Structure formats: structure tokens, C-alpha cells
Amino acid sequence: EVETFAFQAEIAQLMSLIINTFYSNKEIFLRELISNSSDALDKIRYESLTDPSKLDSGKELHINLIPNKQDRTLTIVDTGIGMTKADLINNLGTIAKSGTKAFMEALQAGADISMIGQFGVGFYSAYLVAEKVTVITKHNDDEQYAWESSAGGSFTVRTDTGEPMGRGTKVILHLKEDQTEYLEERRIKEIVKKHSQFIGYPITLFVEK
Numbered sequence: 001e002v003e004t005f006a007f008q009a010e011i012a013q014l015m016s017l018i019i020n021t022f023y024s025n026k027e028i029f030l031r032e033l034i035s036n037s038s039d040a041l042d043k044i045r046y047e048s049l050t051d052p053s054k055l056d057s058g059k060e061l062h063i064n065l066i067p068n069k070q071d072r073t074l075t076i077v078d079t080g081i082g083m084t085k086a087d088l089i090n091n092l093g094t095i096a097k098s099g100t101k102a103f104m105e106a107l108q109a110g111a112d113i114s115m116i117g118q119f120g121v122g123f124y125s126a127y128l129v130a131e132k133v134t135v136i137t138k139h140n141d142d143e144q145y146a147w148e149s150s151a152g153g154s155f156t157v158r159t160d161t162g163e164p165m166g167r168g169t170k171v172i173l174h175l176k177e178d179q180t181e182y183l184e185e186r187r188i189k190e191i192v193k194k195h196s197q198f199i200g201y202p203i204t205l206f207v208e209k
């Protein structure tokens with residue numbers, strides 16, 4: 001049972017701008033997704049200080065980067081707080097509406113796309129390199145969900161039947177044909193070292209067989 005939703009007009013406009021603007025410095029997408037993962041990990045860590053049972057779904061707090069050349073995907077996995085169905089359909093888009101407006105105003109004033117994370121909408125930088133994004137997520141208070149969008153104004157949400165995750169979020173970037181450099185070990189290592197060297201959680205870059 002797949003539900004299809006329309007993006008708000010302003011968010012659809014932001015994704016079209018990201019997909020269509022000429023902008024060579026695409027590698028910042030990885031910093032933005034790792035930053036998101038680190039915030040989600042901060043949130044479950046802090047909540048667990050006053051309710052230890054929130055880690056019954058997994059004590060390890062980490063981030064894994066998994067490239068797969070056969071599927072042409074880069075997966076960013078974290079064991080953070082995860083996202084509820086209401087987050088996926090309502091709450092994140094409500095926050096993202098005001099952040100997008102602020103970001104668009106900044107861009108017209110002279111800013112560049114690399115500053116997107118200062119406006120809370122860094123997730124959408126995934127579409128610098130991905131033709132489709134799939135998000136699998138599990139919050140302690142809800143079921144496991146799959147969110148998916150190839151832009152074009154709509155996204156889907158369904159209950160996910162795959163491998164149970166325990167808790168956290170998996171972002172699967174289905175890369176554009178000319179962006180396969182982000183599947184190479186040496187390239188991912190360079191980007192993490194350059195932009196994410198002080199993240200307070202272990203980042204494991206998986207290697208391919």
C-alpha cells in the first residue's frame with residue numbers, strides 16, 4: 001500500500017533549483033547528510049539519559065557509508081532517533097518551508113548552494129548527485145517506513161517490509177549516471193576528511209567486493 005503525496009510548492013521549487021542550477025561543488029551533499037545523521041544521533045543519545053530504555057532498539061550510535069557499484073547506490077546509515085510517519089509527511093516539510101524561503105532569499109542576495117545547511121534544508125542537497133532518493137527509517141514510537149522521491153513534485157510513503165533496522169535512518173542515493181565518482185573509496189575518504197573530520201560518532205566507510 002503506497003501513498004503518494006505532493007510536495008509543497010516552495011519545496012518543489014527548491015528541488016527544481018537544486019537539480020537544474022549549474023553548480024560544480026556537488027560533494028557537499030555528503031557533509032549535509034552526515035550532519036543530519038549526527039544530529040539524529042545526538043537526539044537519541046540525549047533522550048536516553050532520562051529514559052535508558054530508548055536504547056533497547058540498539059545501543060550502538062554510529063554512521064556507516066555503503067557504496068554499491070552494481071546498484072549504483074550510496075547508502076548513508078545511522079542509528080539515530082529515526083523519523084515517524086508524521087515526520088515524513090507533515091513535520092519535516094513544515095520546518096523546511098521557512099528554511100527554503102530563507103535560503104532562496106540568501107541565494108538571491110549572493111549566497112551559494114554550499115550554505116544550504118545553515119537553513120535546515122540540507123537533506124535536499126542529495127539531489128545534486130541522486131536521480132532518486134529512498135529513505136528507510138524507524139523511530140521507537142512508530143513502524144518502519146520507506147519514503148521515496150524522484151523529484152517532479154511528489155513523494156511516496158509506504159510501510160517497509162524489508163530487513164528490520166532496529167532504530168535509525170538509511171538514506172539510499174540512486175546516483176545519476178555521471179556521478180559515480182561518489183562510489184569510489186578514495187573519493188569518499190577525501191570528502192569525509194575534508195568536511196566531516198570532527199563528527200563525534202564513528203563513521204565507517206564500507207568497501208566493495
Ligand SMILES: CN1C(=O)CCc2cc(Br)ccc21
Nearest residue numbers: 036088092093123135147169
Ligand atoms: C525533509 N525530509 C523529508 O521531507 C522526508 C525525508 C527526510 C529524511 C531526512 Br534523514 C531528512 C529530511 C527529510
